[PDB]
């Protein structure tokens, strides 16, 4: 209470804080999704 | 490859030659530095010149034979003939070479006159802690230049 934020501002700060934490997660998944499935030594169990 | 009528040319850029390139952009800056050094030296030696008195010598070859030039320094015989000492000479603005032997008289009588003129033409102050100061001229190889015979 003394150090600035009251309860409703704690709520309104937490919400946007969480949101900006989730935005970056959506971005990281998008920007990794291409070269996450890129296997160095996949064996391809098929010859005949 | 080899393509047409063009000269054979040797170009020595097979080594990692880009590690070693010296491009002299400095050429205008270190000229300034050299001048400033000359200048502050001129004050650290306040009446004296920057350069010493050097002698004339035949430039050695069949090619440069006819062209005399400034050498390193005077010889002990030339000094002795000039009524001087090899150790007082260096205190005043004279160079000396202990290696150069002289076999020619036309040069001896020249580098002796260069030392007779010098002593007549300079002013030497007594040795103390407030020695007087008159003036500052910088090129004894330009007031005692080197003309050909």
């Amino acid at each position: 209470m003394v150090s600035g934020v009251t309860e409703k501002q704690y709520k309104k700060g937490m919400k946007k804080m969480q949101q900006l934490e989730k935005n970056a997660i959506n971005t990281q998944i998008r920007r990794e999704i291409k070269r996450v499935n890129f296997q160095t030594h996949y064996r391809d169990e098929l010859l005949q | 490859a080899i393509s047409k009528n063009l000269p054979i040319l040797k170009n020595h850029f097979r080594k990692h030659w880009q590690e070693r390139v010296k491009v002299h952009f400095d050429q205008a800056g270190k000229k300034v530095s050299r001048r400033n050094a000359r200048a502050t030296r001129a004050a650290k030696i306040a009446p004296r010149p920057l350069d010493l008195l050097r002698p004339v010598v035949r430039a050695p070859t069949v090619k440069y034979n006819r062209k005399v030039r400034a050498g390193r320094g005077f010889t002990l015989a030339e000094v002795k003939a000039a009524g001087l000492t090899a150790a007082y000479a260096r205190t005043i603005g004279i160079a000396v070479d202990h290696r150069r032997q002289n076999r020619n008289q036309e040069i001896f009588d020249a580098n002796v006159q260069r030392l007779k003129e010098y002593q007549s033409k300079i002013i030497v102050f007594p040795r103390n802690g407030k020695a007087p100061e008159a003036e500052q001229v910088l090129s004894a190889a330009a007031t005692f230049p080197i003309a050909q015979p």
Binding site: Q28, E32, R35, F38, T40 | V21
Partner: protein, 207 residues
């Protein structure tokens, strides 16, 4: 920087995989591991022919050609059709090889000098300058080239006594000595003609 683009260990994966053959970063746990590298095409890669330092920045010119051009540019001053084409407002000038007294080399203030250049008829060129101060176009004005003026008269002397200090501040006006005359002051942008103001003790020294 010579190590631009090559701050990276990257070797191709090759055929077999459904990707190109460009070098590719390796590892995991980030977005770069797999990305391309070592290329002109590749983001985070180098450029084509990185601009090297050794390059003819400065150019030789033959001394007599420089002198030929400087004399030509000195001559074009005397021609008012070129002076006026080049930009200068001289329509109300008495005569064009404009000479004044050599008591101009000795005045020290600036209020005393602009009063002279207004008197011999250069007021319009100075106005032209200080009415032309516009802003530069593009990415030069955050490379220490914010402003642009138009150029002004060129005052020519024989022995500076305060005049150069005086006219150091007025916009556009340049000063020179008859010896050490500069082509970049006489033919700017390669445009012959420049409103020069000579002193009689300079004009005589020219011959």
């Amino acid at each position: 920087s010579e190590k631009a683009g090559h701050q990276t260990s990257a070797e191709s994966w090759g055929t077999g995989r459904a990707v190109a053959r460009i070098p590719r970063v390796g590892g995991g746990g980030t977005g770069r591991s797999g990305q391309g590298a070592f290329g002109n095409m590749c983001r985070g890669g180098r450029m084509f022919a990185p601009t090297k330092t050794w390059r003819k920045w400065n150019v030789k010119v033959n001394h007599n050609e420089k002198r030929y051009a400087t004399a030509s540019a000195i001559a074009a001053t005397a021609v008012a059709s070129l002076v006026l084409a080049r930009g200068h407002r001289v329509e109300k000038i008495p005569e064009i090889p404009l000479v004044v007294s050599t008591d101009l080399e000795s005045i020290q203030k600036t209020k005393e000098a602009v009063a002279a250049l207004k008197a011999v008829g250069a007021h319009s060129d100075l106005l032209k300058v200080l009415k032309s101060k516009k802003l530069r176009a593009g990415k030069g004005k955050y490379r220490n080239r914010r402003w642009t003026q138009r150029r002004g008269p060129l005052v020519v002397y024989a022995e500076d006594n305060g005049i150069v200090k005086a006219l150091r501040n007025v916009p556009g006006v340049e000063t020179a000595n008859v010896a050490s005359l500069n082509l970049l002051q006489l033919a700017p942008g390669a445009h012959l003609g420049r409103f020069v103001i000579w002193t009689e003790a300079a004009f005589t020294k020219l011959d």
